[PDB]
Amino acid sequence: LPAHTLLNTVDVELIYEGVKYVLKVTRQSPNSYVVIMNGSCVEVDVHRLSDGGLLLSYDGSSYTTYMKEEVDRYRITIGNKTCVFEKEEKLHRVFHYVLDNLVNVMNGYCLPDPFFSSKVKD
Amino acid sequence: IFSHAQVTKKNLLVTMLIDQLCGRDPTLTDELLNILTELTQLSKTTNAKVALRARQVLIASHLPSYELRHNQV
Amino acid sequence: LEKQLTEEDGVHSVIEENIKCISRDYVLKQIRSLVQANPEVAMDSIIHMTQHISPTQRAEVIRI
Amino acid sequence: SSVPLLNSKDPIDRIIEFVPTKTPYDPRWMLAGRPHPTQKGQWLSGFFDYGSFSEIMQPWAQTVVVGRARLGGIPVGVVAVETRTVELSIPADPANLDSEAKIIQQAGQVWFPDSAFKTYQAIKDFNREGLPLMVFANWRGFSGGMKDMYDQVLKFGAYIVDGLRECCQPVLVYIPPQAELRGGSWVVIDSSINPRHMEMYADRESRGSVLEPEGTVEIKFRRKDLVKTMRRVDPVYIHLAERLGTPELSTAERKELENKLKEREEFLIPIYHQVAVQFADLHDTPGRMQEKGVISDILDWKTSRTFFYWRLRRLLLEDLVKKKIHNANPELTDGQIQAMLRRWFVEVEGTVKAYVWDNNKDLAEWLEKQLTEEDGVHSVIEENIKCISRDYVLKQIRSLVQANPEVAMDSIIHMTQHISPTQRAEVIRI
Amino acid sequence: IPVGVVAVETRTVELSIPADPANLDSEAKIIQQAGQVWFPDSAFKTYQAIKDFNREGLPLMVFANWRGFSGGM
Amino acid sequence: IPCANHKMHLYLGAAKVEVGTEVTDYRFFVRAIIRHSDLVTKEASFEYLQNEGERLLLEAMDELEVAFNNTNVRTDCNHIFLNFVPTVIMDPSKIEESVRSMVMRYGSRLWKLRVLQAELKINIRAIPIRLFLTNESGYYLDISLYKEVTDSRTAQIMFQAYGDKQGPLHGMLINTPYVTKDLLQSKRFQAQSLGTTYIYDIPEMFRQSLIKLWESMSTQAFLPSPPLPSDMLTYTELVLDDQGQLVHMNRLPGGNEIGMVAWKMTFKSPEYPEGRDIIVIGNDITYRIGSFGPQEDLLFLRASELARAEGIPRIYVSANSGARIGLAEEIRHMFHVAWVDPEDPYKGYRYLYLTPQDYKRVSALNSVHCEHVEDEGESRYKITDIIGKEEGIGPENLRGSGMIAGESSLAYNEIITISLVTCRAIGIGAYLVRLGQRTIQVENSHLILTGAGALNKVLGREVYTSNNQLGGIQIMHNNGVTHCTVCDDFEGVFTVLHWLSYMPKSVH
Numbered sequence A: 001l002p003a004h005t006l007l008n009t010v011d012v013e014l015i016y017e018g019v020k021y022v023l024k025v026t027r028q029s030p031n032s033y034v035v036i037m038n039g040s041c042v043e044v045d046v047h048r049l050s051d052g053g054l055l056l057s058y059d060g061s062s063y064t065t066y067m068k069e070e071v072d073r074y075r076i077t078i079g080n081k082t083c084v085f086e087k088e089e090k091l092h093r094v095f096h097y098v099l100d101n102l103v104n105v106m107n108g109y110c111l112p113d114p115f116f117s118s119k120v121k122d
Numbered sequence B: 001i002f003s004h005a006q007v008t009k010k011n012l013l014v015t016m017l018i019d020q021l022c023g024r025d026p027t028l029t030d031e032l033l034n035i036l037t038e039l040t041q042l043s044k045t046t047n048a049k050v051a052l053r054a055r056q057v058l059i060a061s062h063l064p065s066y067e068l069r070h071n072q073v
Numbered sequence C: 001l002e003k004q005l006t007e008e009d010g011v012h013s014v015i016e017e018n019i020k021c022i023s024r025d026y027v028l029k030q031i032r033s034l035v036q037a038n039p040e041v042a043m044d045s046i047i048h049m050t051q052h053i054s055p056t057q058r059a060e061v062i063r064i
Numbered sequence D: 001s002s003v004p005l006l007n008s009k010d011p012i013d014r015i016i017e018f019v020p021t022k023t024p025y026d027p028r029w030m031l032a033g034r035p036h037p038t039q040k041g042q043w044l045s046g047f048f049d050y051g052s053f054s055e056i057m058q059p060w061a062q063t064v065v066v067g068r069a070r071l072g073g074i075p076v077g078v079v080a081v082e083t084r085t086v087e088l089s090i091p092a093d094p095a096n097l098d099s100e101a102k103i104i105q106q107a108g109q110v111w112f113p114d115s116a117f118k119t120y121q122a123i124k125d126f127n128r129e130g131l132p133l134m135v136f137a138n139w140r141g142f143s144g145g146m147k148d149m150y151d152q153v154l155k156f157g158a159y160i161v162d163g164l165r166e167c168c169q170p171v172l173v174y175i176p177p178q179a180e181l182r183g184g185s186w187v188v189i190d191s192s193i194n195p196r197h198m199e200m201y202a203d204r205e206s207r208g209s210v211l212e213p214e215g216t217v218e219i220k221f222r223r224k225d226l227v228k229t230m231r232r233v234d235p236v237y238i239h240l241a242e243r244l245g246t247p248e249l250s251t252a253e254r255k256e257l258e259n260k261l262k263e264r265e266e267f268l269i270p271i272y273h274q275v276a277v278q279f280a281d282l283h284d285t286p287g288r289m290q291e292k293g294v295i296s297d298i299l300d301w302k303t304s305r306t307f308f309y310w311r312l313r314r315l316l317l318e319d320l321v322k323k324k325i326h327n328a329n330p331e332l333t334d335g336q337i338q339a340m341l342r343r344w345f346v347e348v349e350g351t352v353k354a355y356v357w358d359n360n361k362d363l364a365e366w367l368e369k370q371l372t373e374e375d376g377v378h379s380v381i382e383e384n385i386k387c388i389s390r391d392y393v394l395k396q397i398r399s400l401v402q403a404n405p406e407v408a409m410d411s412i413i414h415m416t417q418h419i420s421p422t423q424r425a426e427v428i429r430i
Numbered sequence E: 001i002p003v004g005v006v007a008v009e010t011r012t013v014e015l016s017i018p019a020d021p022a023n024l025d026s027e028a029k030i031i032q033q034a035g036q037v038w039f040p041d042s043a044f045k046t047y048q049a050i051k052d053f054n055r056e057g058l059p060l061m062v063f064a065n066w067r068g069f070s071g072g073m
Numbered sequence F: 001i002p003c004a005n006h007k008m009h010l011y012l013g014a015a016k017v018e019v020g021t022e023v024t025d026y027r028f029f030v031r032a033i034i035r036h037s038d039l040v041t042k043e044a045s046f047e048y049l050q051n052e053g054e055r056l057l058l059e060a061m062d063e064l065e066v067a068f069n070n071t072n073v074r075t076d077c078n079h080i081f082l083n084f085v086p087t088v089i090m091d092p093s094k095i096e097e098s099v100r101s102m103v104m105r106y107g108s109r110l111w112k113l114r115v116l117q118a119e120l121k122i123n124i125r126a127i128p129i130r131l132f133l134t135n136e137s138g139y140y141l142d143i144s145l146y147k148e149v150t151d152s153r154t155a156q157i158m159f160q161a162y163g164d165k166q167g168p169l170h171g172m173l174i175n176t177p178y179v180t181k182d183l184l185q186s187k188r189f190q191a192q193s194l195g196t197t198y199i200y201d202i203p204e205m206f207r208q209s210l211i212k213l214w215e216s217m218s219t220q221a222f223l224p225s226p227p228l229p230s231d232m233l234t235y236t237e238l239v240l241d242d243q244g245q246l247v248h249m250n251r252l253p254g255g256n257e258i259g260m261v262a263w264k265m266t267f268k269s270p271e272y273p274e275g276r277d278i279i280v281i282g283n284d285i286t287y288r289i290g291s292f293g294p295q296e297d298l299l300f301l302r303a304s305e306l307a308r309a310e311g312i313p314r315i316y317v318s319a320n321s322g323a324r325i326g327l328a329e330e331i332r333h334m335f336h337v338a339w340v341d342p343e344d345p346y347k348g349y350r351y352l353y354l355t356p357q358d359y360k361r362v363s364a365l366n367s368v369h370c371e372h373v374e375d376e377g378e379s380r381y382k383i384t385d386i387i388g389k390e391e392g393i394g395p396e397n398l399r400g401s402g403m404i405a406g407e408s409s410l411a412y413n414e415i416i417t418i419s420l421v422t423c424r425a426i427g428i429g430a431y432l433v434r435l436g437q438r439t440i441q442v443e444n445s446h447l448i449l450t451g452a453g454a455l456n457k458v459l460g461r462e463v464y465t466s467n468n469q470l471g472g473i474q475i476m477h478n479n480g481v482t483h484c485t486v487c488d489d490f491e492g493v494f495t496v497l498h499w500l501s502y503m504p505k506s507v508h
């Protein structure tokens, strides 16, 4: 198969109460996910749960999340709440951190086109 | 295949790496030279960016540093 | 024939009016042959034709 | 109607036993075959079902062969090419006492005016019969001598194109083994003349080019280029030339070296000429054609039949449902239709099975089921076709009145005479 | 008004055929062709002319003095 | 041209011309100097020469890219000069090899930047030598080595070669300027040498012919007053964009990057005093002479599609040599022969193989197929198929030919098709004419399929001596392929327009 269908990026369009949000989702690692929403990037530490849910770390606090796909709806459960969308530092930890990030870039896990090269040079 | 898919971004990072490895230090050991030799033999055009810059290093680290001439003269 | 075809803004070509009448009748017969062979679209066919008609024609449609 | 298929006796899972050779062969020997040369019986198979090939116009234009046959029980028309020499017998005219009978020579793999006329006539007849067409091409080109240019060969060369362009059934061109299509013969049977129906295939042991090896050698490999090749291949030439260019030796030694160089340059020519011929033949290969995209696949001779069955059948079945689509929406083109069938197929089977489209057996079975099954699964393909027909009729009525509003009042009333009371309420209220 | 025209020779013509240099035993020939008569080539020409004139979009005029088709061997 | 790092010196020269014709020959030149002490060769002097020359060449290519892409002057033959000041002890063959590698590794870029020539001065032991390189498309480098001979009675220096391939510079003094015409006055001669006109001479004759037409039909009819030759004609060139669609462009002549040209003409004829539109198409006999490539076929196709859409006539002026052929040139140079006996080549050869050294730098381009073999203890890449990286030399020109063949077949049955034969037409270019079915031929021209040379080779003697024995007026007009004969192209064009005098302005 050609090497442009094995992509690491997904555009997801979710409509909430009339406002359509077009988000991009890629990865910096097997477990490190990057989400572009409203033109802003956020990194999320994601681990797969055996029950189909996901264990997320987004803003320091941890979350257990589930999704249900309907005929025309996406029901996203977080904890005990639901959101329904309509379908249309010590100088030596830094070394290991940035080295792992760059090696992930070398293995094909790279940021999206509009945000790439703004963080890698640093 | 997944790694080869993002070869353009890999090329950008590789250029940034080569900029800091053999920049303001006109000297090359017998290990860097082998990597650069293999890297210049990437005849496929998508990797030309990483080959071309590598050749610059292979020719760049054989020049005077302005210190010899300045001091002697 | 030259006069009837090449004359415009003049005698106005009764030949042309006859041609327009034949075209009109053909379009009518074609629409009716289309739905008579395909009644299943009749409800979809009526509604669009109620969007570009006069109020008096609408009254005639409703009453008849 | 469609072409009638038989539950033939000669299978489809067999191989072709007769293999074309590089020496002369009768092209019939690769359509029907021949009895065993070493036995008294034991028919050596050919491309088609045994006893099914039937000739026409045999003694006319003997350099070309045409007929009708069956492939898997599917009727086809066939066009093949003589590689043997034939002798054309012309009689004398009794109206002229100074006239004499003549025997002209006719080499195979070559078009003549009469052979091209025959090919054209056969194409037209087979097409109007409603048959698919098989073409076994081993033409080197058209005769260019005074007689043939006088005897109008360009004319029938062009009529071949005119005939093929108007075919309404599958046309499959196959370049057999030890065969080659050159230039003037390519341009008259290329698949781009009618891509909706024409397909081309090539064996591994076949050739295609815009010219043979020798004619290209004669232009690209001149004497000076053969010499420049000698400069880096021949050790003797290399020794003598490295010595002659070695400065400050002498005059007489330079003269002797130059004479020896000229002698070797004249001596080595046949061998380097053959080298040039092989370097020419190395880019007349079918892999180059597959890579460039001028043949659909590279086939083995022996298995050929089992391919051409399932392809051909598939196309026939496609041509049925596509026709129905063309009957539903006559304004749809053919790429739209192939894409539509892709869409329908993946929708009803799923995306996991989207790879089952370039698998002619399975897809032909699926199309056969969807078209030939009634009072059963009820043909979701047929429901899709009905929906397209519905939408076409609707679009047609609306395009008709949108271009002619003057009849709108006359159009509504008749459609209020054969509608329900609830539909009448919907009409009145909306 | 532009028209395409087809007419018929009543004079005798002599058809000159050359020899083929590919055959050393070949000779030039002069065949006799009487007018008011179809031959294969004359009928082919008439057909070609008809098709061309029609596809030009022209009317056609035809001045017919044909006795029939040649039936000799 | 200003540039950073002011040790490189880039110039753009505009050829000097009189107060009449403007300048058409523009040329980028690069002049750089190389500063270092003399080298003491201990098998370690290649590095200085190679590295300095390559660095300057890369900087020159970058500045040339910037300057060339920032302006519009249409240079043709860019040139580079590098002066190696320090002395080096090195055999000229090693210098040839080194500069060959250094140049071939960037031949692709130098081709893209229209860099065709180079001059390298090196002091040996010191005696100066001059390397004159011609770098056409990046597969072969024509290297010419010369020494400067100062053994003269005056201050004049001479170029003297090394016996092998003296070349054009033998006896050229030391210092000669350059200038050319670069287009439009060498292609005219190139065409006139073959008996046809340069393609961009088509419209003028066209206009001129119509003037004669406005005389000719005035002895039949009580015509209106004729229009002015300025108003008698107006045309727009049809060019190809990057996608394959026609752009209606107005540009100066000579700008064709392909061997085909197309015009849409509006003119006034005695039959239609206001409005008459046609499409005209022509082959450029000067560009890789004649031969049909994929882009030529594409322009043909789109032009005919336009004419069929509008419903207007199509005219085709044919001057061609058939489909384009060729061979993978790089492979044609880098290949070796495995003899049955290396000492007696007349015993036969077993195969043609590449070495790994040169295989590894081509195969990623999809130019060749080889099989690995082990023979005589050596690892070898026996060639099986040769594909070629250059587009427009292979079977793709067959695919193209049939395509346009079909178009002609269609165009005959939808619109008026006329074809004109001026110099020659071979293969497809003959069949295309016959697919138009209204064929005009010029005297001393020929429609052929096979050449006299090839036929005589298969026959074994000099049967045919000219190709007009096969496809001339004595064959093609006496058999019914050509409708009308003419002496030149102006007569052909007047005949085309006379024929259109009988025909409607459109299919509608």
Ligand SMILES: CC(=O)SCCNC(=O)CCNC(=O)[C@H](O)C(C)(C)COP(=O)(O)OP(=O)(O)OC[C@H]1O[C@@H](n2cnc3c(N)ncnc32)[C@H](O)[C@@H]1OP(=O)(O)O
Residues within 6 Å of the ligand: D182, D183, D184, D186, D187, D210, D211, D219, D220, F288, F289, F291, F321, F322, F323, F324, F325, F326, F426, F427, F428, F429, F451
């Ligand atoms: C249409 C088909 O499908 S088959 C037709 C395919 N092409 C052919 O058959 C080509 C026919 N042969 C010829 O080229 C004819 O001999 C001619 C007259 C057109 C050329 O012969 P010449 O008068 O000797 O010109 P010449 O061969 O020098 O052509 C100029 C150069 O262009 C090249 N060239 C010639 N013809 C062609 C061609 N058809 N396609 C591509 N390149 C060509 C040659 O390598 C030649 O090299 P040179 O200049 O270094 O000698």
